[PDB]
Design a protein around this ligand. Sequence first.
Ligand SMILES: [Zn+2]
Length: 31
Amino acid sequence: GSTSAMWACQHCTFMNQPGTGHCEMCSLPRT
Ligand SMILES: [Zn+2]
């Protein structure tokens, strides 16, 4: 809801918040 810049994971293939470097799908890091 209006944030900095989300990201697209390369495991679960879902969108994630700019602060959730991990993930709400796989449970892994952004890197
Ligand atoms: Zn993920």
